[PDB]
Write a protein that binds this ligand. Structure first.
Ligand SMILES: CCCCCCCCCCCCCCCCCC(=O)OC[C@H](COP(=O)([O-])OCC(O)COP(=O)([O-])OC[C@@H](COC(=O)CCCCCCCCCCCCCCCCC)OC(=O)CCCCCCCCCCCCCCCCC)OC(=O)CCCCCCCCCCCCCCCCC
Ligand SMILES: CCCCCCCCCCCCCCCCCC(=O)OC[C@H](COP(=O)([O-])OCC(O)COP(=O)([O-])OC[C@@H](COC(=O)CCCCCCCCCCCCCCCCC)OC(=O)CCCCCCCCCCCCCCCCC)OC(=O)CCCCCCCCCCCCCCCCC
Ligand SMILES: CCCCCCCCCCCCCCCCCC(=O)OC[C@H](COP(=O)([O-])OCC(O)COP(=O)([O-])OC[C@@H](COC(=O)CCCCCCCCCCCCCCCCC)OC(=O)CCCCCCCCCCCCCCCCC)OC(=O)CCCCCCCCCCCCCCCCC
Ligand SMILES: CCCCCCCCCCCCCCCCCC(=O)OC[C@H](COP(=O)([O-])OCC[N+](C)(C)C)OC(=O)CCCCCCCCCCCCCCCCC
Ligand SMILES: CCCCCCCCCCCCCCCCCC(=O)OC[C@H](COP(=O)([O-])OCC[N+](C)(C)C)OC(=O)CCCCCCCCCCCCCCCCC
Ligand SMILES: CCCCCCCCCCCCCCCCCC(=O)OC[C@H](COP(=O)([O-])OCC[N+](C)(C)C)OC(=O)CCCCCCCCCCCCCCCCC
Ligand SMILES: CCCCCCCCCCCCCCCCCC(=O)OC[C@H](COP(=O)([O-])OCC[N+](C)(C)C)OC(=O)CCCCCCCCCCCCCCCCC
Ligand SMILES: CCCCCCCCCCCCCCCC(=O)OC[C@H](COP(=O)(O)O)OC(=O)CCCCCCCCCCCCCCC
Lengths: 46, 54, 72, 96, 713, 505
């Protein structure tokens, strides 16, 4: 596996950050959705 | 409607009825075809759960 | 409006003008368990759900989540 | 045709002997003789012919126990594949 | 043996255990490793004091140790695996674990109970969570399983039980769809969900069951679900007093869910599954009257056409899979341009790959959209009950081809065959359907041919290439066709299943709500000036392309089809309601009896009227929302995932005098046709001379009014 | 983590299931022969026929469970054997592990057992279809044909030896052994009088192909004295010998597995045979030929164009699909459907040992189950309505809703809806055929899935729908629990077998 999109510069990243954009970042599964969660198992027991 | 008849008074409104299958509810024969097929289903499901699932 | 009602044999398991006295409890006991089953299915499926970035988010090309070509 | 014995000894057949009554007096010279056996089948009350009428928990218990065994067996198999005595749960899980 | 005493002892034990837990937690925080020095001190007095004051902790630890020992034994027995961590004897293990109290170091009973209680608190759910994770799948599964289980358990759910269960499920589904409609259409929200690895389709391939909730999917899904909710509410009245109402309701629900699955398909396999499911369920709906074999003939006709379409779709999918080793819709859409240059070596001709794939897709789309030649089944499909007919003909069965074209637009943009075939066939179908509907005498047949004409117009709009215009046309047609179908269903039920209006006359008073509802629905459906349905045809004519070799025929057919709407609308409305009484005497007499005069008097259903009213209101609101989203100066529609720009919006934003005057030709043609259908006399009447006089008055007054408005003010 | 314990457990299970079946059969036969002077039923509740029926049914069922376990063990064993062979790359290291036989039971026919995925699929089909057919033939076996209760156990033993043997001669002998029990069943158990001629037609038509295969086997054995099925790697047949062998093998096995024009016997036998034995015939007895053809043609190197064989198979498919429409007899219509599916499966084997074999195997399994379902539905229709003709049968749904629902869902499954092994097999075959010859693929798909499908659906829809106004005093009630659960199990397998491990498919 290797990067497919063309590369960008750290200066450009800083410029975007100053402009106010945010870097897309995947979020962890919430306790309800996570199958390894005490909340999930409490829901199952209920 | 003009002359609608209530269910409690309509003599042709049907409640759930009929026999699910052709087997006699009160049968004295020690028939085992149904038991054999139920066993086949249950054993297939158990094998899938305990050998294949996951 | 509708056709005139006619007798239906008792032995025959058919739906002609079938009305159940306990339909309220039948609906109660058929709705909620189905809702629980579908909630379980939905929470299982959400693990493999994909959404595009939000309004103020951009995908960094060098981030791992960015698509990567095959390396021979 | 069928050759099995009707009169079983495992249990007594439910019956009602009052629906049909055999005449025993006031006969005529042209009337046929009455019938000796006049018992009819009596179903238990609340019996619904349109469903299985099953009230046992054996099947549900068996299926649930099988599913639980499958779950624990999969957990152990995953631990073995990862080469650990038990699953090492991570702090965060993402979509996949 | 007293419940009160048991509860009091339990509460006291809970309080004592909580106090002991807090004390132990503090002592452990202070004696991380030295706590044993005081807990297990050799002094008998100290040992007894600790045991007595931590008895709840010690008994809890003993119970936990016993449970863990038994659980470990069960696991070892079941899995033939290892020992209880070690081979410790029972006595040693139980004593060690009971004496060990570090298990309670971070445990507080009140905190644990509070966590358990708040786990199920419903205040936490937020719109952010809903946006991140769609509940559309949850509600759709609710509806699907409700329908399936209601079908299976008919005896348990009587008429009322089935109706209420399916109503609740469908209402929840529609509300969720409505909530997500705003986000998907305007906020650029779309989801790609996967349920699992469905099947293996090659030596190492395995296609997953995936759904794609995008703008293209939602446009059809929300329309179908919104129409279906009110069709469901209306069916319980249309099939009132019928032997089989639950069967019809469940068939309608099944068809709705099948179409929803088809439209919201994540890959070609799911798309084909939805295609087959809609075909089968439409067959069942058409063959609802199973006892009659005459209905079976129409059902089999529709089945044969559906199977031909299935063949074409399957072959196209096979070609796509052979070319690209992938069945994902997004991947195919974003890859087809690379393989556009490829050709396929067939029997004796080297056919272009794009052309052949688009040919199969367009063939299946025409078959399922009832275009010219393949429309023969649609008129025969009217044997179904009016709710089913409305559902199939409004947005569910006859829009499958439109959905296919919209979803696979990148393929057809590079298709020479599509360019030549879509406009010609669309215009021919439009003209044919419009004229046949205008000359038709039966209500259901008229609506069917109008649906054919609108499908042709949709094909021509797609050829124009403005997906926004196509979506607007689809929404308008579906909503108003459904409303008109419901109205004519009420009319037919009143007229005792006689669908021909040659036996209908003077029904305005007997069905007051139906008359006005049909008036509104028909003026909207048939493109008429100063109506919500005028803009769809206006945009179609704006976007019509002129480079076609058969442009003369295409344009003439389009004009004739567009004008044909007025004739059928006028005939249906006037003949049904305001024409002389032509029906049997009994139809009027049975309802005109004075005994029936009451506050409850009506020839239709109150639920039917409310459903029709709500459907019309929601259709107006949604059409206005779409018009604001697309046709407004500020373009706010979500991304269409297409890179083909047609330039048609230039003549909608800054039209030139040429086009502005050209549209006037069609406007005045429609005006003259309206004047003809209004003032033209076909039978002798006492008002012939006065009608001619009124026509003269109207002409002269119009002239003078125009003079004053333009010049004299 | 794979260990020798799994290897030996797999081998022991495979070897011992056969002896379990053999001992059950031997004990049942001994009891039957030595309990009565004359081996016929005593028409009383204390007859040995009840015990024999119980023994056969619940020997087949228990052996089927053990076969499930052994098949799973084989899957694990084969996957790990492939991994062991492939993984190691060091030249010094080589996978040479030798297994010593058990000292409890002998090796039947002094042959070391070899098992393959196709063979075990065939054996599983044998088990399930035999169970269905034995459940069906209860009403047919009465007081002089009770000796045929062991026919399906004999079939199971023959098929077990057929699929667990690495010897060419034993393979051929097991293939040929199937004729006698089937002929006896058709001759002595078929109610219809035309069954007498149908049996002779079946015997002669199948024996012509058996003679062709015998000639091929004689060519192989005389030229190559080997019999181990693997020494053929070191011997190459000349062009003439190879073409003769392939032609003989194909024609001989197509006589059994119906191909155009050799399906007259199949139609006659299906029409005039017991409703319970037609299930077994169509489901299984036409696929041993496919398995033998696969084995022989993959063992032999063939340097000839397969266009002629492909054309024969496609012509058979087209012929059956076209003829589907004109059949008012449900059993004959199902026979034509069987011909079509078998011809498609056979076409799947026309590219040697290419990937088409996977699609062929999956289609064989789905066709077995689907044909069992269709013939069982026809059996129920004929048994409760005393006719299997469309003109005499109409409106089944309105008097027997469960039977009509079963018919409709059978039609839906036959249509090849996604989510079914039928659809998966169609996808495999058509995906291969599109690249092999796209125009031929288009013609085949068009014909089979439109014209044949419409012809098939016309009769079934006409039977299911309508209004049964005739003979109101004699109408039946509904399906029984046995029939309902058989139909449900067929549907469940057709649906869930798509989740089987994709390693072997
Ligand atoms: C020893 C060898 C054998 C010897 C012989 C033995 C013979 C014995 C006899 C029996 C045969 C045995 C053969 C072996 C079997 C092997 C099994 C096995 O290994 O098991 C493990 C196998 C794989 O396990 P694994 O890989 O080891 O597990 C670990 C993986 O990580 C697990 O994760 P995963 O991601 O891999 O998960 C897999 C699974 C995980 O499962 C789930 O997550 C469950 C999902 C359930 C979804 C339910 C609803 C879906 C449909 C609705 C979608 C849209 C909703 C609305 C959308 C609205 C949006 C706007 O996910 C999926 O596959 C998702 C597919 C979802 C669609 C399913 C239904 C599709 C339609 C099928 C149609 C066919 C019938 C048509 C009838 C036509 C009329 C006649 O798992 C399963 O068995 C999965 C079974 C799932 C069943 C799904 C339920 C079916 C629902 C049917 C609905 C149809 C409705 C009617 C249709 C229309 C009628 C008109
Ligand atoms: C598009 C096509 C669509 C087609 C479909 C359309 C829709 C169709 C709808 C209608 C048909 C289907 C739905 C309804 C079916 C009927 C359901 C029902 O309830 O009927 C009543 C039906 C008749 O009732 P019945 O006349 O009273 O007969 C009762 C049964 O004979 C016997 O019952 P029982 O009460 O005597 O209970 C017996 C139970 C006995 O249960 C128990 O014994 C469980 C409780 C004890 C647990 C162990 C404790 C040991 C220690 C002692 C502790 C103290 C004692 C505790 C027990 C106290 C007693 C409760 O024994 C078993 O079940 C044996 C199974 C064992 C193997 C499998 C499970 C184990 C796996 C491995 C486990 C490993 C871990 C555990 C290790 C254990 C240690 C070695 O009964 C059943 O439910 C029997 C089950 C089978 C019914 C038929 C199934 C047909 C399914 C059709 C599926 C079709 C799928 C098609 C899919 C198509 C997709 C395209
Ligand atoms: C009359 C029939 C005629 C048939 C012949 C004609 C055939 C063709 C035409 C068909 C149409 C005509 C016939 C239809 C009308 C029938 C009329 C009739 O008899 O009415 C009464 C019939 C029975 O009602 P009843 O007499 O009042 O009550 C019966 C007893 O009270 C019940 O007692 P119980 O409450 O103790 O229940 C015992 C046991 C019921 O016992 C059984 O059914 C034995 C099953 C043994 C295994 C066989 C394989 C099953 C394959 C899956 C399908 C499950 C069975 C459901 C039916 C098929 C689906 C429609 O119940 C359960 O515990 C259910 C759980 C079963 C799941 C077993 C899974 C095994 C592994 C499968 C492979 C791997 C899967 C991995 C999944 C991964 C996670 C997603 O009406 C119904 O209740 C219909 C039920 C329909 C099925 C839905 C309910 C079960 C749902 C299970 C879970 C799946 C949903 C989503 C799961 C999501 C989370 C995982
Ligand atoms: C694990 C996840 C969930 C598992 C669930 C799996 C469900 C599998 C499918 C179950 C189908 C059940 C059908 C029951 C039919 C009962 C009889 C009936 O309705 O009356 C027959 C009616 C009249 O029946 P009747 O009134 O004479 O008798 C009823 C009572 N019995 C049958 C018991 C005597 O006859 C007909 O005319 C036939 C109509 C057949 C209509 C079938 C439509 C099915 C539509 C399903 C749509 C599903 C969409 C899926 C989308 C997603 C796909 C991935
Ligand atoms: C020549 C100039 C260039 C244009 C070329 C085209 C010329 C115009 C062609 C018009 C064809 C209209 C066919 C309508 C058929 C409707 C059938 C129907 O529903 O039944 C009849 C319905 C009446 O239905 P009814 O139910 O009330 O009663 C029917 C009674 N019987 C059966 C006895 C006939 O409507 C009419 O009667 C109206 C149609 C006849 C009058 C047509 C007038 C045409 C005026 C053209 C003006 C052109 C303006 C200039 C610009 C044009 C080009 C841009
Ligand atoms: C050199 C050694 C030679 C060994 C030869 C073996 C001799 C076999 C003799 C069989 C006699 C059968 C009748 C026994 C009396 C039954 C009395 C009765 O009905 O009361 C109920 C009692 C007890 O019933 P129950 O009500 O307690 O039910 C529980 C049943 N068990 C105990 C099995 C869990 O007896 C039976 O149920 C026994 C049934 C026997 C028939 C079984 C038929 C299935 C197939 C196996 C048959 C045997 C073949 C060998 C094994 C298979 C191959 C490995
Ligand atoms: C379809 C007919 C009706 C149904 C019944 C089936 C009967 C026919 C069964 C198939 C027989 C084989 C036909 C294809 C032969 C292809 C090879 C060939 O001959 O090419 C010349 C071959 C191949 O030649 P070549 O040119 O390819 O290469 C070798 C060339 N030289 C020798 C010059 C170096 O040449 C030969 O060596 C001649 C062999 C002729 C063999 C013909 C007789 C076969 C006898 C055994 C089978 C008999 C079955 C009878 C069954 C009962 C009938 C009632
Ligand atoms: C805008 C939508 C309008 C229409 C909504 C229709 C109703 C939809 C169903 C309710 C919502 C379900 C998704 C919840 C998502 C989630 O977990 O959202 C997360 C929240 C917790 O918040 P956090 O995880 O963000 O901290 O979950 C909960 O609070 C779970 C409590 C239960 C919620 C309802 C469960 C419904 C399923 C059936 C229950 C049956 C109970 C027993 C009956 C006898």
């Amino acid at each position: 596996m290797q990067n497919a999109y063309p590369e960008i510069t750290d200066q450009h990243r800083e410029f975007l950050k100053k402009q106010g954009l945010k870097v897309y970042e995947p979020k962890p599964l919430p306790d309800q959705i996570n199958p390894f969660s005490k909340t999930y198992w409490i829901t199952n027991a209920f | 409607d003009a002359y609608y008849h209530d269910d409690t008074h309509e003599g042709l409104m049907n409640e759930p009825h009929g026999y699910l299958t052709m087997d006699d509810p009160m049968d004295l024969r020690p028939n085992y075809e149904k038991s054999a097929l139920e066993l086949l289903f249950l054993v297939s499901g158990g094998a899938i759960l305990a050998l294949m699932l996951g | 409006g509708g056709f005139q009602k006619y007798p239906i044999p008792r032995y025959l398991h058919v739906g002609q003008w079938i009305v159940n006295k306990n339909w309220k409890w039948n609906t109660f006991h058929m709705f909620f368990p189905t809702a629980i089953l579908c909630f379980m299915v939905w929470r299982n499926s959400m693990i493999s759900t994909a959404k595009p970035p939000n309004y103020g988010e951009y995908v960094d090309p060098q981030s791992p989540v960015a698509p990567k070509a095959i390396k021979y | 045709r069928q050759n099995f014995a009707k009169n079983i000894t495992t249990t007594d057949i439910p019956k009602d002997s009052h629906h049909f009554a055999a005449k025993r007096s006031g006969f005529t010279q042209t009337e046929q003789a009455p019938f000796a056996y006049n018992d009819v089948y009596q179903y238990p009350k609340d019996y619904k012919p349109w469903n299985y009428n099953y009230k046992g928990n054996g099947v549900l218990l068996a299926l649930f126990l099988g599913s639980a065994f499958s779950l624990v067996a999969y957990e152990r198999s995953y631990a073995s594949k990862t080469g650990r005595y038990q699953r090492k749960v991570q702090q965060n899980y993402y979509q996949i | 043996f007293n419940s009160i005493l048991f509860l009091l002892f339990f509460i006291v034990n809970l309080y004592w255990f909580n106090s002991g837990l807090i004390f132990f937690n503090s002592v452990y925080k202070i004696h991380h490793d030295a706590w044993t020095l005081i807990f297990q001190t050799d002094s008998i007095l100290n040992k007894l004091k600790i045991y007595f004051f931590l008895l709840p902790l010690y008994i809890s630890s003993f119970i936990h140790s016993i449970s863990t020992w038994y659980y470990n034994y069960i696991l070892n027995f079941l899995l033939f695996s290892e020992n209880l961590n070690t081979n410790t004897n029972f006595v040693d293990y139980i004593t060690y674990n009971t004496l060990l109290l570090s298990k309670f170091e971070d445990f507080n009973l009140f905190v644990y109970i509070k966590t358990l209680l708040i786990t199920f608190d419903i205040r936490q759910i937020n719109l952010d969570f809903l946006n991140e994770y769609p509940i559309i799948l949850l509600t759709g599964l609710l509806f699907l399983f409700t329908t399936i289980f209601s079908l299976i358990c008919l005896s348990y759910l009587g008429l009322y039980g089935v109706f209420i269960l399916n109503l609740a499920s469908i209402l929840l589904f529609w509300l969720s769809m409505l909530y997500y409609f705003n986000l998907i259409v305007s906020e650029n929200y779309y989801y790609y969900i996967s349920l699992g690895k469905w099947m293996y389709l090659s030596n190492g391939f395995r296609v997953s069951f995936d759904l794609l909730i995008d703008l293209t999917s939602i446009s059809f899904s929300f329309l179908t679900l919104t129409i279906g909710v009110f069709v469901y509410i209306y069916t319980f009245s249309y099939f009132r007093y019928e032997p089989l109402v639950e069967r019809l309701i469940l068939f309608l629900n099944s068809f709705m869910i099948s179409m929803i699955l088809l439209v919201s398909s994540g890959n070609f396999i799911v798309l084909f599954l939805g295609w087959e499911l809609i075909g089968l369920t439409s067959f069942f709906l058409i063959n609802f009257w199973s006892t009659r074999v005459g209905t079976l003939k129409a059902a089999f006709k529709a089945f044969s056409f559906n199977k031909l379409s299935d063949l074409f779709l399957f072959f196209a999918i096979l070609i796509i899979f052979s070319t690209t080793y992938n069945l994902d819709i997004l991947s195919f859409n974003n890859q087809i341009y690379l393989y556009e240059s490829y050709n396929i070596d067939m029997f004796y001709w080297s056919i272009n790959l794009i052309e052949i794939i688009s040919f199969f897709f367009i063939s299946c789309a025409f078959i399922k959209s009832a275009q010219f030649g393949a429309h023969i089944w649609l008129p025969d499909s009217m044997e179904a009950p009016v709710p089913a007919s409305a559902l199939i003909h409004s947005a569910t069965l006859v829009s499958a081809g439109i959905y296919l074209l919209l979803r696979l637009s990148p393929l057809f943009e590079l298709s020479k065959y599509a360019y030549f075939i879509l406009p010609l066939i669309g215009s021919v179908t439009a003209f044919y359907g419009g004229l046949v509907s205008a000359f038709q005498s039966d209500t259901k047949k008229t609506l069917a041919y109008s649906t054919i004409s609108h499908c042709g117009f949709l094909m021509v709009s797609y050829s124009t290439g403005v997906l926004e215009f196509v979506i607007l046309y689809l929404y308008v047609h579906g909503f108003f066709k459904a409303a008109t179908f419901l109205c004519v269903g009420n009319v037919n039920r009143f007229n005792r299943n006689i669908q021909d209006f040659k036996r209908m006359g003077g029904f305005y008073k007997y069905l007051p709500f139906e008359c006005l509802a049909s008036f509104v629905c028909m003026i909207n459906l048939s493109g008429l000036p100063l109506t919500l349905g005028f803009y769809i045809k206006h945009l179609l004519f704006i976007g019509l392309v002129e480079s076609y070799t058969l442009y003369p025929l295409i344009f003439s057919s389009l004009i004739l089809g567009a004008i044909a709407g007025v004739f059928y609308s006028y005939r249906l409305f006037y003949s049904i309601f305001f024409d002389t009484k032509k029906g049997k005497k009994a139809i009027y007499l049975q309802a005109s009896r004075i005994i029936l005069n009451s506050k409850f008097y009506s020839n239709t259903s109150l639920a039917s009227n409310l459903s029709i009213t709500f459907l019309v209101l929601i259709s107006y609101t949604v059409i206005l929302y779409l018009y604001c989203t697309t046709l407004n100066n500020y373009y706010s529609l979500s991304d269409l995932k297409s890179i083909y720009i047609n330039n048609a919006y230039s003549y909608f934003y800054k039209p030139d005098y040429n086009f502005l005057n050209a549209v006037s030709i069609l406007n005045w043609f429609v005006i003259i046709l309206l004047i003809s259908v209004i003032y033209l006399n076909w039978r002798w009447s006492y008002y012939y001379t006065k009608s001619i006089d009124s026509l003269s008055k109207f002409i002269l007054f119009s002239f003078f009014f125009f003079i004053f408005s333009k010049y004299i003010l | 983590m794979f260990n020798l314990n799994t290897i030996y457990l797999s081998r022991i299970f495979i070897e011992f299931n056969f002896y379990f079946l053999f001992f059950l059969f031997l004990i049942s036969s001994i009891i039957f022969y030595f309990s009565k002077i004359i081996s016929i039923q005593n028409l009383n509740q204390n007859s040995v026929f009840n015990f024999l029926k119980l023994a056969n049914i619940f020997g087949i069922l228990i052996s089927f469970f053990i076969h499930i376990i052994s098949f799973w063990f084989y899957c694990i064993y084969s996957y790990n054997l492939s991994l062991n062979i492939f993984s190691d790359i060091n030249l010094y290291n080589s996978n040479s592990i030798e297994l010593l036989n058990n000292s409890l039971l002998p090796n039947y026919f002094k042959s070391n057992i070899t098992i393959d995925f196709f063979g075990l699929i065939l054996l599983t089909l044998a088990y399930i279809v035999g169970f269905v057919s034995i459940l069906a033939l209860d009403t047919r076996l009465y007081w002089k044909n009770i000796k045929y209760i062991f026919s399906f156990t004999i079939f199971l033993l023959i098929v077990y030896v057929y699929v667990t043997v690495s010897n060419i001669l034993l393979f051929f002998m097991c293939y040929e052994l199937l004729l006698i029990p089937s002929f006896l069943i058709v001759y002595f158990v078929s109610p219809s009088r035309r069954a007498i001629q149908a049996s002779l037609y079946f015997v002669i038509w199948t024996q012509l192909g058996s003679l062709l295969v015998l000639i091929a086997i004689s060519y192989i054995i005389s030229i190559t004295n080997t019999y181990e099925f693997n020494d053929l790697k070191y011997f190459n047949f000349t062009n003439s010998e190879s073409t003769i062998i392939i032609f003989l093998i194909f024609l001989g096995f197509g006589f059994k597995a119906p191909i155009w024009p050799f399906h007259y016997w199949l139609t006659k036998t299906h029409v005039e045979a017991p409703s319970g034995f037609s299930i077994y015939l169509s489901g299984f007895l036409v696929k041993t030929a496919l398995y033998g053809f696969y084995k022989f043609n993959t063992s032999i190197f063939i340097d000839i164009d397969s266009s002629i064989f492909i054309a024969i198979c496609i012509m058979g498919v087209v012929d059956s699909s076209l003829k589907m429409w004109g059949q008012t007899d449900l059993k004959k219509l199902v026979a034509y459907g069987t011909i079509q599916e078998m011809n498609i499966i056979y076409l799947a084997f026309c590219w040697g040992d290419s990937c088409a074999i996977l699609g062929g195997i999956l289609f064989s399994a789905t066709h077995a189950f689907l044909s069992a379902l269709m013939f069982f539905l026809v059996d129920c229709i004929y048994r409760r309505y005393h006719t299997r003709s469309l003109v005499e049968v109409n409106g089944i749904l309105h008097i027997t809703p469960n039977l009509g629902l079963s018919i409709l869902f059978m039609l839906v499954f036959f249509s090849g809806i996604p989510g079914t092994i039928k659809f998966i097999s169609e996808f495999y075959i058509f995906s291969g055929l599109l690249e092999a010859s796209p125009f031929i693929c288009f013609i085949l798909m068009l014909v089979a899935n439109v014209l044949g499908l419409i012809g098939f659906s016309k009769s079934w829809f006409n039977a299911t729908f309508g209004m049964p106004k005739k003979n109101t005093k004699y109408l039946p009630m509904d399906l029984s629990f046995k029939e309902s659960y058989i139909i449900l199990y067929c549907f469940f397998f057709l649906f869930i077998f798509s989740y089987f491990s994709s390693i072997f498919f």
